[PDB]
């Protein structure tokens with residue numbers, strides 16, 4: 001039975017906010033996840049996104065597959081195209097990353113992963129942008145509350161999310177048609193928070209913290225979390241519930257908190273009906289470096305954009321986006337922009 005919280009519209013640092021932050025942390029530490037109650041506008045925007053997704057997925061595969069970019073990972077992923085732990089995943093996906101035209105300086109400079117979303121049409125665009133604006137407001141509330149719960153300055157995490165690399169996976173899982181029930185293999189997501197919505201069908205499972213269990217640090221190339229614990233209990237079924245979004249930590253929160261929070265492992269099983277879901281990632285700025293909050297003498301850092309880029313390359317080894325990164329050596333520029341950027345987001 002997951003906890004459900006209603007968040008205040010604004011987080012100011014009053015005693016109630018600090019208390020709520022404590023409760024959110026405790027719920028993550030016990031269950032790995034909690035629910036936040038949605039209001040009528042949050043719910044309306046969620047349902048309109050789900051409807052736009054259903055309409056897009058009915059389009060011919062050739063059209064859907066045309067919604068791709070060799071500059072950004074935004075756009076369509078066919079069923080069986082994404083790889084997790086060396087195995088194909090089943091959903092068809094539309095990924096929405098920061099929507100930057102070729103007029104944006106970062107795109108002109110060839111920064112990896114920067115470019116325009118290949119929207120299927122302008123009504124889908126509007127529905128997703130409106131939904132993501134609402135999701136971002138919730139992400140910011142959550143980050144202020146989390147800082148307060150850890151007795152940190154209220155802006156500790158939001159100082160890293162200005163022009164944050166927020167993105168979303170808009171998913172349709174097919175019904176199970178073969179002996180394979182795997183929708184998406186076990187994995188952790190990459191940023192600060194994951195805020196997710198699902199329809200009535202059901203299929204998401206999450207792994208709570210387990211006392212004494214070692215957790216891989218998925219930001220390290222020798223400790224990928226993909227596939228870990230796939231067939232070992234415990235896995236908590238996330239029961240579809242009207243009027244909520246779920247929230248769990250990603251890799252950056254695990255790193256920054258030194259494991260006081262864990263990036264929640266999760267997986268999806270195919271059901272007897274198709275299943276629509278949306279997973280939103282509230283992320284640092286592409287140029288931000290995460291740091292350990294509770295060990296100021298520690299030298300380890302995560303350059304967020306580098307983590308994102310490495311992850312998407314491992315998800316999509318053969319996508320035109322990955323090919324162009326390799327061809328133009330755009331990972332090198334990612335090392336360069338660490339020291340010669342002009343965006344003023346850092347330094």
Ligand SMILES: NC(=[NH2+])NCCC[C@H](N)C(N)=O
Nearest residue numbers: 082083084085187189226315
């Ligand atoms: N958040 C994503 N882009 N994908 C989530 C699934 C796991 C991913 N294929 C992996 N190997 O980490």
Ligand SMILES: O=C(O)CCC(=O)C(=O)O
Nearest residue numbers: 169171198204268277279
């Ligand atoms: O299908 C879901 O409910 C979550 C999917 C997910 O974890 C992802 O797309 O990263």
Ligand SMILES: [Mn+2]
Nearest residue numbers: 188189266279
């Ligand atoms: Mn995920």
